[PDB]
């Protein structure tokens, strides 16, 4: 009469007495003998009678199983089996007592389906969906087993979450390939800029994670998930979904737990992992970031990561970002800024009636997943997507026919295409200045083709040339042909380019809120010999801490303004000197009325066709600073060779030359005098001296990576000049501070 066993089917199982969790069949083995004891985990087994109850065609619960099967096979890629069925449909739920000093795990009865409402409110031995004696009872012994690694080793199937908050975003994916149950019959309200997941077979979008693939740095930290990442993916994806669903408060483990819905003891494992994973993504700045603020005893990282102190040099976006991160983590942070204000190259003039005019940055280039878009969401502020339209207006007042604009843009880009071909097989030593290579290709193309451009077509080509010089912040003869667009090899920020109407100052101010910031404290010296870094200001003040982070602009690193002891390495100096310190300047003009409205007809900007290639980049674009079209403020830009021509002019002389230009651009009409203006002088600001970085002839994009290497795990570097993927921008500077705060916290 066949054979029967007390013991589990799996050699090495730690259950000395399997007991059937199902009790689905009339002849369930309860806790005795059966023809096979089917193993789900070390703590969960079901007898063969209950196995036949669902499996065999002549048995009762066969319709229930066959129906689940059909749902399973059509929505998922994971095979259906009785074990998979049991784990998705028959294992009981486990929940923690929500009383703070208890937190004990309990098994719910079978008919109860775990809601996030139950998980938020459950207390020991009180019937859910609803004395303190029931808390003192010991947990089921199987609970403690779960937290060992060998428990996960002995788990036969990975968990599949139900009703994950991630699910509305992952519809393009098989639910089980991203850790969600296929038997689960279930993005309005989320910010259009939060797109944290790639769609399948999609790349080239910055800061998107693949919802079905762990990343290298994730596998490094969680190698136990390398073979089968189902479970890690489920929890990471859940945390991301929860964060972007509410980026204005800190996302705690307490907050994640009631959204982790899975049957069986494995839920305990998930609740224990979510917390580890959460602290990891916090340190890495993927969540719980932006201008989020925490109070005392509400720090974002456990007291372990708290045994450090940091001095941060420079209170620009990179410095304040690291300071805000490190502070939120619970690390002592002091920021020493040279100037008498924070912000660095973010400095918003607020004195123009009705608008905020930035003397430094005010544009966000690519808003999807951009942390600046995150921080705007957190602050409730709005960004203005730039319009496409930008007439090229001639001195004289003629508006250049758009087909000329477009045709010369074509020829121009066709020149850059030849550079990209030429450079493919050339090393850093073979490099050649970009402008020089363009002139060669152009003069070769003119000579070969016979074509003859009108004067205007040539001037319009000069305009497109000036824009490139603006993007590099340099005449193109200092810019590397090989490596000027180096960072476009990496995924870039998709989406809208915007004018940050309220100005970056609003973000910079909120980042700095509440931090120990010593202004008028320019750092003279950093000595990282000895047990602690010693930092000294220009008047002799001394500050001390265990680690120091440097965010000074590239120009200041090039000029050696801070004495380093020991000196920076030769490798680091060569990198620092291989990047160029690009420069632009800005002028803002306020008028008594919007004199351009009739001609410009609402566009966000208009173009200034340069008269000659010498005057190239002199007020090339005028920006209308009020997207609501009520106030009268224009802003324009000096780039390229034009920067060196106006160093010997005072502000009034620059203003006059701008006004002469506007009046030529509007020659057929009257232009009022300006009533208020400013002219920036970044290139002579002693502690900045630049607008943003670029790669000079002979250098490589790797220069950014090299400038970013820490020294002795003790001196760290951040700043736009240190972000290889995202050079130049406030965004790239911000992310580099987060990057460095992640490095520092790791110790
Ligand atoms: C200038 C400018 C202008 C005029 C304009 C613009 C700009 C600029 N940009 C840029 C930005 O801003 C930058 O990049 C940033 O900011 C960076 O940051 P960082 O890194 O943080 O730096 P800074 O800020 O500079 O800071 C620094 C600091 O530190 C200090 N110091 C120094 N030294 C020292 C100190 N302390 C102490 N001790 C010592 N020794 C100083 O003071 C400071 O504070 C920009 N950006 C963006 O994003 N956007 C915009 O819009 C901008 N801009 C314009 O306009 C345009 C440009 C652009 C680009 F570039 C790119 C792109 Br794709 C775009 F979209 C745009
Ligand atoms: Zn049974
Ligand atoms: Zn077993
Ligand atoms: Zn309890």
Residue-by-residue DSSP string for 233-261: HHHHHHHHHHHHH-TTS---HHHHGGG--
Q: Cβ(349)–Cβ(355) under 8 Å?
A: no
**Same domain flag for 680 and 747:** yes
Q: Cβ(369)–Cβ(207) under 8 Å?
A: yes
Task: Enter the tokens of residue 655.
Answer: 């203003």
Q: How many Å apart are CA 197 and CA 214, to the nearest integer? A: 12
Ligand number nearest to the C-alpha of 138: 4
Per the structure, the complete domain to which residue 510 belongs is given by 300-747
Name the strand (E) or helix (H) holding 549. Answer: strand 547-550
Angstrom CA distances, 320 to 295, 551, 557, stand at 17, 10, 19
Task: Enter the tokens of residue 514.
Answer: 């509440």
CA 22 to chain centre: 46
| Whole-number CA gyration radius for the chain | 32
Q: Which of 488, 520, 552 is the best mutation target for the ligand 1 pocket, counting ligand atoms within 8 Å of the beta carbon and taking the most?
A: 552
Q: Whose CA is nearest to atom 3 of ligand 1?
A: 360
Q: Whose CA is nearest to atom 54 of ligand 1?
A: 361
Q: Whose CA is nearest to atom 65 of ligand 1?
A: 365
Q: Is 57 exposed, middle or buried (0-12, 13-18, 19+ CB in 10 A)?
A: exposed
**Same domain flag for 525 and 648:** yes
Any idea what DSSP says for residue 300?
A: S
Residue 341 CA to ligand 1 centre (angstroms): 14
Q: Cβ(633)–Cβ(588) under 8 Å?
A: yes
Q: Whose CA is nearest to atom 48 of ligand 1?
A: 729
**Same domain flag for 536 and 589:** yes
Q: Does ligand 1 have an atom closer than 6 angstroms to the CB of 363? A: yes
Q: Say which experimental method was used.
A: X-ray
* β-pair type (533-537, 542-545): antiparallel
Angstrom CA distances, 622 to 346, 383, 428, 587, stand at 20, 19, 37, 10
**Same domain flag for 671 and 701:** yes
Name the strand (E) or helix (H) holding 692. Answer: strand 692-695
- To one decimal, the resolution in angstroms is 2.8
Place of tokens 């100005």: 503
Ligand number nearest to the C-alpha of 122: 4
**Same domain flag for 323 and 220:** no
Helix (H, G, I), strand (E, B), or coil: what is residue 334? strand
Residue 100 CA to ligand 4 centre (angstroms): 8
**Same domain flag for 130 and 66:** yes
* β-pair type (348-349, 579-582): unpaired
With CA atoms as reference, report the closest residue to 721 among 687, 693, 690.
Answer: 693
Residue numbers in the known binding site for Zn(2+) are 8, 13, 20, 28, 39, 45, 47, 50, 97, 102, 124, 135
**Same domain flag for 292 and 341:** no
Strand partners, 693: 581
Q: How many Å apart are CA 46 and CA 36, to the nearest integer? A: 9
Q: How many CB atoms lie within 10 A of CB 189?
A: 5
**Same domain flag for 286 and 330:** no
Residue 175 CA to ligand 3 centre (angstroms): 27
Helices 504-512 + 317-329 axis angle, to 10: 40
Q: Does ligand 1 have an atom closer than 6 angstroms to the CB of 553? A: yes
**Same domain flag for 618 and 720:** yes
**Same domain flag for 311 and 211:** no
**Same domain flag for 517 and 619:** yes
**Same domain flag for 188 and 312:** no
Helices 730-746 + 266-283 axis angle, to 10: 120
Q: Cβ(405)–Cβ(446) under 8 Å?
A: no
With CA atoms as reference, report the closest residue to 379 among 480, 451, 292, 297.
Answer: 292
Residue 38 CA to ligand 2 centre (angstroms): 10
Q: Does ligand 1 have an atom closer than 6 angstroms to the CB of 552? A: yes
Whether omega for the bond prior to residue 211 falls within 30 degrees of 0, making it cis, is no
Ligand number nearest to the C-alpha of 9: 3
Q: Torsion angle, CA of 102/107/111/115, rounded to 10 degrees? A: 50
Ligand number nearest to the C-alpha of 98: 4
Q: Does ligand 1 have an atom closer than 6 angstroms to the CB of 320? A: no
Q: Cβ(563)–Cβ(547) under 8 Å?
A: no
Q: Cβ(498)–Cβ(385) under 8 Å?
A: yes
Q: How many Å apart are CA 199 and CA 197, to the nearest integer? A: 6
Q: Does ligand 1 have an atom closer than 6 angstroms to the CB of 517? A: no
Residue numbers in the known binding site are 8, 13, 20, 28, 39, 45, 47, 50, 97, 102, 124, 135, 308-364, 523, 720, 728-730
Q: Whose CA is nearest to atom 4 of ligand 1?
A: 360
Place of tokens 């009022």: 672
The residue among 299, 328, 349 that closes a domain is 299
The residue among 299, 320, 342 that closes a domain is 299
Helices 455-472 + 402-423 axis angle, to 10: 50
The residue among 282, 299, 316 that closes a domain is 299
Residue 106 CA to ligand 2 centre (angstroms): 21
Helix (H, G, I), strand (E, B), or coil: what is residue 139? coil
Task: Enter the tokens of residue 546.
Answer: 């265990």
Q: Whose CA is nearest to atom 40 of ligand 1?
A: 523
Residue numbers in the known binding site for FAD are 308-364, 523, 720, 728-730
Q: How many CB atoms lie within 10 A of CB 604?
A: 19
- Name the domain count of the chain: 2
Q: How many Å apart are CA 742 and CA 597, to the nearest integer? A: 49
């Amino acid at each position: 009469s066949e054979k029967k066993y007390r013991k589990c089917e799996k050699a090495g199982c730690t259950a000395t007495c399997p007991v059937c969790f199902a009790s689905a069949s009339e002849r369930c083995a309860k806790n005795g003998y059966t023809s096979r004891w089917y193993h789900l985990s070390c703590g969960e087994h079901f007898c063969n009678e209950c196995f036949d109850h669902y499996y065999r065609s002549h048995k009762d619960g066969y319709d229930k199983y066959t129906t689940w099967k059909k749902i399973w096979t059509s929505n998922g890629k994971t095979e259906p089996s009785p074990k998979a069925f049991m784990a998705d449909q028959q294992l009981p739920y486990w929940v923690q007592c929500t009383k703070p000093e208890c937190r004990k795990w309990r098994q719910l009865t079978k008919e109860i389906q775990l809601t996030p409402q139950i998980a938020k409110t459950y207390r020991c031995g009180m019937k859910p969906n609803t004395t303190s004696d029931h808390c003192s009872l010991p947990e089921d012994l199987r609970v403690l087993e779960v937290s060992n690694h060998w428990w996960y080793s002995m788990l036969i199937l990975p968990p599949l979450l139900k009703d994950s908050v991630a699910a509305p975003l992952l519809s393009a994916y098989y639910p089980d390939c991203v850790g969600m149950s296929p038997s689960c019959t279930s993005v309005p309200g989320m910010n259009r800029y939060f797109q944290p997941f790639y769609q399948p077979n999609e790349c080239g979008k910055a800061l998107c994670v693949r919802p079905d693939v762990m990343e290298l740095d994730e596998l490094y930290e969680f190698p136990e998930y390398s073979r089968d990442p189902t479970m890690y993916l489920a929890l990471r994806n859940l945390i991301l979904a929860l964060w972007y669903t509410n980026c204005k408060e800190a996302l705690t483990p307490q907050k994640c737990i009631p959204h982790i819905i899975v049957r069986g003891l494995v839920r305990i494992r998930c609740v224990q992992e979510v917390e580890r994973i959460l602290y990891f993504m916090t340190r890495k700045g993927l969540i719980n970031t932006g201008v989020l603020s925490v109070g005392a005893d509400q720090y974002l990282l456990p007291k372990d990561y708290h045994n450090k102190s940091v001095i941060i040099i420079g209170a620009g976006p990179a410095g304040l970002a690291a300071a805000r991160q490190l502070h939120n983590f619970g690390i002592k942070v002091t920021v020493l800024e040279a100037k008498d204000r924070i912000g660095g190259r973010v400095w918003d003039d607020k004195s123009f009636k009705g608008v905020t005019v930035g003397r430094g940055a005010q544009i966000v280039n690519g808003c999807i997943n951009n942390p600046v878009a995150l921080m705007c969401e957190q602050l409730g502020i709005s960004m203005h997507k730039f319009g496409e339209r930008c007439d090229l207006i001639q001195e004289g007042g003629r508006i250049t026919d758009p087909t000329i604009d477009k045709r010369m843009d074509f020829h121009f880009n066709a020149l850059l295409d030849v550079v990209s071909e030429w450079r493919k097989d050339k090393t850093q030593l073979q490099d050649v200045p970009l402008g020089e290579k363009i002139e060669e290709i152009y003069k070769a193309f003119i000579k070969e083709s016979g074509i003859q451009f009108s004067e205007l077509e040539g001037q319009v080509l000069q305009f497109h040339l000036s824009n490139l010089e603006y993007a590099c912040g340099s005449n193109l003869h200092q810019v590397s042909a090989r490596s000027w667009d180096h960072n476009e090899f990496f995924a870039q920020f998709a989406g809208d380019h915007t004018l940050l109407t309220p100005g970056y100052s609003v973000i910079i101010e909120k980042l700095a809120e509440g931090l120990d910031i010593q202004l008028k404290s320019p750092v003279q010296c950093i000595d990282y010999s000895g047990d602690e870094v010693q930092v000294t200001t220009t008047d002799g003040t001394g500050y001390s801490a265990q680690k120091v982070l440097v965010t000074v602009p590239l120009a200041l690193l090039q000029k050696g303004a801070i004495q380093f002891n020991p000196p920076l390495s030769e490798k680091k100096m060569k990198a620092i000197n291989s990047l160029g310190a690009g420069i632009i300047e800005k002028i803002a003009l306020q008028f008594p009325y919007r004199f351009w409205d009739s001609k410009v007809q609402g566009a966000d900007f208009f173009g200034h066709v340069p008269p000659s290639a010498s005057k190239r980049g002199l007020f090339a674009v005028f920006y209308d600073m009020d997207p609501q079209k009520k106030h009268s403020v224009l802003m324009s830009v000096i780039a390229g060779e034009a920067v060196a021509s106006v160093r010997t002019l005072d502000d009034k002389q620059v203003l006059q030359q701008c006004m002469a230009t506007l009046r030529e651009l509007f020659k057929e009409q009257e232009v009022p005098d300006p009533t208020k203006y400013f002219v920036t002088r970044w290139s002579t600001d002693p502690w900045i001296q630049m607008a943003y970085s670029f790669v000079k002839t002979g250098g490589s994009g790797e220069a950014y990576d090299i400038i970013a290497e820490d020294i002795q795990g003790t001196v760290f570097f951040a700043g736009e000049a240190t972000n290889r993927h995202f050079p130049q921008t406030v965004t790239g500077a911000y992310l580099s501070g987060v990057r460095e705060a992640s490095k520092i916290a790791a110790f």
